[PDB]
Amino acid sequence: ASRQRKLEALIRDPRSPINVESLLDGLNSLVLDLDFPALRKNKNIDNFLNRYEKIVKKIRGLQMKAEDYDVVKVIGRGAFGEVQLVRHKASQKVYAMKLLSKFEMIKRSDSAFFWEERDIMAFANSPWVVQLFYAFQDDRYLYMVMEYMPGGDLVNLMSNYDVPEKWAKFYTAEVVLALDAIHSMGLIHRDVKPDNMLLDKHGHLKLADFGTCMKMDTPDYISPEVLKSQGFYGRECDWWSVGVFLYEMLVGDTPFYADSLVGTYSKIMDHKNSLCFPEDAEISKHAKNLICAFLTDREVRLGRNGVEEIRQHPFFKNDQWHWDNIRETAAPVVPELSSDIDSSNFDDIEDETFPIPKAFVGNQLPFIGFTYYR
Amino acid sequence: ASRQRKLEALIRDPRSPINVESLLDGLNSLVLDLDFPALRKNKNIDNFLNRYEKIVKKIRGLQMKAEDYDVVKVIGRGAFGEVQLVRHKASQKVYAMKLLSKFEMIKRSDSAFFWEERDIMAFANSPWVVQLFYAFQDDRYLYMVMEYMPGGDLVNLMSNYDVPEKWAKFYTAEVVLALDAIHSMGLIHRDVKPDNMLLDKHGHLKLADFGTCMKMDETGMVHCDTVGTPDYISPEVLKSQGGDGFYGRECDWWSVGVFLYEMLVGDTPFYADSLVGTYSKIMDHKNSLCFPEDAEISKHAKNLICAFLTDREVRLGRNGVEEIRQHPFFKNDQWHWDNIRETAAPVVPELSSDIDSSNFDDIEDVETFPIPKAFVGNQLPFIGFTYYR
Ligand SMILES: COc1cccc([C@@H](C)NC(=O)[C@H]2CC[C@H](c3ccncc3)CC2)c1
Ligand SMILES: COc1cccc([C@@H](C)NC(=O)[C@H]2CC[C@H](c3ccncc3)CC2)c1
Ligand SMILES: [Cl-]
């Protein structure tokens, strides 16, 4: 009764490794790993599969899958897959779907990063983090269905407008609160850049792409400790990147730009001397102060002693918004969109399986527990 | 919504292969089959086990297990295990626990029979079938916790009393209704005998041991398997196992013929010193069936036995149970067919405690799977066995 009530609660919990969706993943994965003619020479395997042949087919039909979605356009490419703008066929609702190749993750020794990515987007319950509605999988891919962000990213905005300081104040303030939310969850991002800052239908920021997230105990935006470490470091390394972001928005170039990557690496390490505001750049004293406060050695960097000292910096003083209502004021640039599939703010994009194994190799074991239904 | 409601129903259903207990069995079995040092040289396996190390330990603690029961006495022994009279420690309630060796089942190519046995005892919801409260498993055994029949079996009764025909009428009538219940569930028993007929606290029959149960076809027929203990097997069941013969519910009615003969006469109708002698007498039943001249038996009782102990084609119970029920032998002043189990039994057991096993005869180390070199899947056969009432 009491031991049964504890076991039933462990299964009910959406955070649990033994939720109902995880246990089904265990069954599916096992059937996929076992159902090959050479393995069925084992009586244990063949009998097991005969028993679970029909019911696993019936689950595969009932469960969510890629064929439930029409692909409209490819809106991203990454190391292990792509991002598809999709419409779910039944509901007719539009999402951004991220695909991850199982073969490549196993081939390139990188098949754990997606857990924190899934958890952040699923469970943050935060307006600064892209919401995940569904995670599911086939034999070839992991899928992550997310709220579509039709405003596009800060790279797109920056190339389309000269950003005045009133706007930069706003976007930097929204990045500060997004990072504070990530940090509050016990997480360092490690890859803060405009590419990973997206604007919703109302022109307000959310963070996406949590592939480099780690739970706490491109070279333009990397901090000098992260350069010297080559693998310890803390939340302060994200605050470096906000320093670089604000510089990029106001100046229009990266502060440690060079023709080669080695030139950039060498400038970043020499930041005390190489940080230099151009004499033609329209930038205030307070804005130079904040950038300089972020672009220092880790030991004395702004945000080391919490977010509060970032919030009371004079740069962020203004007549338009407060910190506790910023996301409910009018954004600088409302996207003008023609439809629920308008991907005009995203640039156009242009483009092997596991072998049939001789014995059990367990290629699906890494992905057991990935399925999540909101 | 609708596709989600179908998936949620499949999981809710206690009959389903993908109930919550089955899915947990899948996880446990997988961990047990994979957690060996040589297999963890695979990164997929090692990482998987690291992820599920703590939670599987926590499930093993929470789930029902053999250490939740005190073993009081061994009351049975069988091909693949034994029977323990047990007391559950927390509730203090007494059950009969049947164990089944996983090693032996795999070693001796026989690891499917327990499914129908588990299902019959769990789901029959019938006073003629022993109730199963819990099925669980460890790495070595399947366990089946059922209600304890402190009256013991009809072998025990027959050796302790000269059975008069009024008693034989009663026990045979209770067997007829038990078999009719099994047959109504789409099942042939194939091994009906006194050993498998137990008496509850009130001295009334229930069938136990469903290891030779088969599910019938849409034409009421069944495929060959298993036999041992030849005394009660029918001649079609003898002829079939040589070849690939077919047989139906009528083969259980042969066994009731043999039962009633044993109760009234006191010996088996086809007895011999060797098993081959018994087999030869059963096949020659037209000539070998002979009532001894000193046997106290009625004309009606000889009629019923003879009606059962014939060729399948003309055997009683071929055309349903009703013609068995209207046979004059079963006429009496004490019970009707619809209230038999609620009248006073011939022999109510007087028992001195909840652990009194006086109606069960006294009974007096094991080997495990080797540490495998690769994945062999020894636990895959037993996924879905766990049932909590
Ligand atoms: C590691 O293998 C990858 C495969 C594909 C993409 C990516 C990485 C670089 N890309 C991403 O994470 C996108 C995902 C879609 C997000 C989005 C949400 C809502 N609207 C528009 C975009 C924006 C980040 C990595
Ligand atoms: C095939 O591997 C076997 C392993 C152990 C036992 C058996 C066979 C011979 N034995 C059985 O089925 C028993 C089970 C307990 C029942 C019971 C119920 C309630 N009270 C007392 C006993 C009586 C039948 C077979
Ligand atoms: Cl009657």
Instruction: Give the separation between CA B66 and CA B61, rounded to whole angstroms.
Output: 12
Compare all CA atoms of chain B with the CA of A59 and give the residue at the minimum distance: B7
Compare all CA atoms of chain A with the CA of B39 and give the residue at the minimum distance: A361
Instruction: Give the separation between CA A52 and CA A78, rounded to whole angstroms.
Output: 36
Instruction: Give the separation between CA A208 and CA B4, rounded to whole angstroms.
Output: 29
DSSP sequence for B193-223: SGGGEEE-TTS-EEE---TT-EE--TTSEE-
B378 touches chain A (CB under 8 A): yes
Instruction: Give the separation between CA B247 and CA B263, rounded to whole angstroms.
Output: 26
Nearest by Cα to A44 from B388, B213, B369, B226: B369
Compare all CA atoms of chain B with the CA of A105 and give the residue at the minimum distance: B44
B115 touches chain A (CB under 8 A): no
Total length of chain B? 389
**Cβ neighbours of A44 in B, within 8 Å:** 106, 376-378, 380-381
Instruction: Give the separation between CA B98 and CA B146, rounded to whole angstroms.
Output: 8
**Cβ neighbours of B388 in A, within 8 Å:** 4
**CB B83 less than 6 A from any atom of ligand 2:** yes
Q: Where are the alpha helices (DSSP H) in chain B?
A: 2-12, 20-34, 43-51, 53-62, 102-107, 114-123, 154-160, 165-184, 235-242, 250-265, 275-283, 285-288, 299-308, 322-325
Q: Which residue CA neighbors atom 25 of ligand 1 most closely?
A: A78
Query: Is the Cβ pair B45, A362 closer than 8 Å?
Result: yes
In degrees rounded to 5, what are phi and psi of residue B83?
Answer: -120, 130
Cβ neighbours for B377, distance < 8 A, ≥ 6 positions apart = A34, A42, A44, A45, A48, B33
Instruction: Give the separation between CA B40 and CA B71, rounded to whole angstroms.
Output: 37
Structure tokens at A119: 């958890």
B26 touches chain A (CB under 8 A): yes
Assess contact for B198 and B130: CB atoms under 8 A.
yes
Q: Which residue do the tokens 């050695």 mark?
A: A297
Q: Which residue do the tokens 């070998």 mark?
A: B288
Ligand nearest to the CA of A105: 1
Cβ neighbours for A266, distance < 8 A, ≥ 6 positions apart = A258
Compare all CA atoms of chain B with the CA of A11 and give the residue at the minimum distance: B20
Instruction: Give the strands of the sheet with A152-153, arranged side by side.
Output: A152-153, A197-199, A205-207
Instruction: Give the separation between CA B378 and CA B224, rounded to whole angstroms.
Output: 25
CA–CA min distance B266, chain A (Å): 45
Assess contact for B153 and B314: CB atoms under 8 A.
no
Instruction: Give the separation between CA B81 and CA B110, rounded to whole angstroms.
Output: 13
**CB B94 less than 6 A from any atom of ligand 2:** no
Q: Which of B33, B191, B200, B252 is catalytic?
A: B191
Q: How far is the CA of B96 from the centre of ligand 2 (A)?
A: 9
The helix, strand and coil proportions of chain A, stated in percent and rounded to the nearest 5, come to 45, 15, 45
Neighbour tally for A313: CB within 10 Å? 14
Q: Which residue CA neighbors atom 3 of ligand 1 most closely?
A: A78
* Burial degree of A234 (CB within 10 A; 0-12, 13-18, 19+): middle
Q: How far is the CA of B249 from the centre of ligand 3 (A)?
A: 23
Assess contact for B85 and B356: CB atoms under 8 A.
no
H or E stretch covering A228: helix A224-229
Assess contact for A100 and A142: CB atoms under 8 A.
yes
Nearest by Cα to B214 from B202, B206, B223, B205: B223
Pairs from A178-181 (Cβ < 8 Å, separation ≥ 24): A178/A128, A178/A129, A178/A205, A178/A206, A178/A207, A179/A207, A179/A238, A179/A239, A179/A242, A180/A307, A181/A124, A181/A126, A181/A128, A181/A129
Instruction: Give the separation between CA B340 and CA B36, rounded to whole angstroms.
Output: 57
Assess contact for B132 and B122: CB atoms under 8 A.
yes
Closest atom of ligand 1 relative to the A147 alpha carbon: 19
Structure tokens at B85: 């009279």
Closest atom of ligand 1 relative to the A113 alpha carbon: 1
Active-site residue numbers of A?
A: 191
Which of A10, A27, A47, A370 to mutate: most B Cβ within 10 Å? Answer: A27
Query: Is the Cβ pair B27, A24 closer than 8 Å?
Result: no
Structure tokens at B321: 């149970």
Query: Is the Cβ pair B48, A10 closer than 8 Å?
Result: no
Compare all CA atoms of chain A with the CA of B377 and give the residue at the minimum distance: A44
DSSP 8-state symbol, B129 = B
Q: Which residue CA neighbors atom 23 of ligand 1 most closely?
A: A208
Q: Which residue do the tokens 């899915």 mark?
A: B23
Instruction: Give the separation between CA A258 and CA A220, rounded to whole angstroms.
Output: 9
How many residue pairs from chains A and B have C-beta atoms closer than 8 A? 103
Nearest by Cα to B165 from B336, B349, B301, B309: B301
Instruction: Enumerate residues lining ligand 1, CB below 6 A.
Output: A 76, 78-83, 96, 98, 100, 130, 146, 148-149, 198, 208-209, 211
Structure tokens at A73: 């356009």
DSSP 8-state symbol, B189 = -
Instruction: Give the separation between CA B21 and CA B55, rounded to whole angstroms.
Output: 15
The fold of A152-328 is Transferase(Phosphotransferase); domain 1 (1.10.510)
Q: Which residue CA neighbors atom 24 of ligand 2 most closely?
A: B209
**Count of helices and strands (H, E) across chain A:** 14, 11
* Nearest-10 crossing angle of helices A43-51, A20-34: 130
Assess contact for B174 and B259: CB atoms under 8 A.
no
Total length of chain A? 374
Closest atom of ligand 2 relative to the B117 alpha carbon: 12
Instruction: Give the separation between CA B348 and CA B361, rounded to whole angstroms.
Output: 18
Resolution in A: 2.8
Query: Is the Cβ pair B377, A48 closer than 8 Å?
Result: yes
Cβ neighbours for B359, distance < 8 A, ≥ 6 positions apart = B150, B151, B152, B156, B199, B349
**Cβ neighbours of B383 in A, within 8 Å:** 48, 51
B11 touches chain A (CB under 8 A): yes
Q: How far is the CA of A211 from the centre of ligand 1 (A)?
A: 9
Assess contact for B212 and B232: CB atoms under 8 A.
no
Query: Is the Cβ pair B48, A368 closer than 8 Å?
Result: yes
Instruction: Give the strands of the sheet with B81-88, arranged side by side.
Output: B69-78, B81-88, B94-101, B141-146, B132-137, B387-388
- Of A43, A111, A362, nearest to B42 by CB-CB distance is A362
Experimental method: X-ray
Q: How far is the CA of B177 from the centre of ligand 3 (A)?
A: 12
A52 touches chain B (CB under 8 A): yes
* Nearest-10 crossing angle of helices B235-242, B250-265: 130
Assess contact for B86 and B69: CB atoms under 8 A.
yes
- Of B7, B30, B52, nearest to A62 by CB-CB distance is B7
A11 touches chain B (CB under 8 A): yes
**CB B130 less than 6 A from any atom of ligand 2:** yes
Assess contact for B353 and B289: CB atoms under 8 A.
no
**CB B129 less than 6 A from any atom of ligand 2:** no
Q: Which residue do the tokens 């038999």 mark?
A: B340
**Cβ neighbours of B59 in A, within 8 Å:** 7, 10, 18
What type of residue sits at position A216?
A: M
Instruction: Give the separation between CA B323 and CA B186, rounded to whole angstroms.
Output: 20
Q: Which residue do the tokens 């001195």 mark?
A: B352
What type of residue sits at position B109?
A: S
**Count of helices and strands (H, E) across chain B:** 14, 13
Instruction: Give the separation between CA A300 and CA A26, rounded to whole angstroms.
Output: 48
Query: Is the Cβ pair A20, B18 closer than 8 Å?
Result: no
Instruction: Give the separation between CA A137 and CA B325, rounded to whole angstroms.
Output: 59
Which of A39, A113, A360, A372 to mutate: most B Cβ within 10 Å? Answer: A360
Cβ neighbours for A25, distance < 8 A, ≥ 6 positions apart = A137, A367, A368, A369, A370, A371
DSSP 8-state symbol, A83 = E
Structure tokens at A82: 């792509």
DSSP 8-state symbol, A315 = G
Instruction: Give the separation between CA B116 and CA B122, rounded to whole angstroms.
Output: 10
- Of B23, B381, B388, nearest to A48 by CB-CB distance is B381
DSSP sequence for B29-68: HHHHHH-STTGGGSHHHHHHHHHTHHHHHHHHHHS--GGG
A59 touches chain B (CB under 8 A): yes
* Burial degree of A366 (CB within 10 A; 0-12, 13-18, 19+): buried
Ligand nearest to the CA of B333: 3
Would you tell me which residues 330-359 of chain A have a C-beta closer than 8 angstroms to some C-beta of chain B?
359
Architecture of domain B152-342: Orthogonal Bundle (1.10)
Assess contact for B202 and B147: CB atoms under 8 A.
no
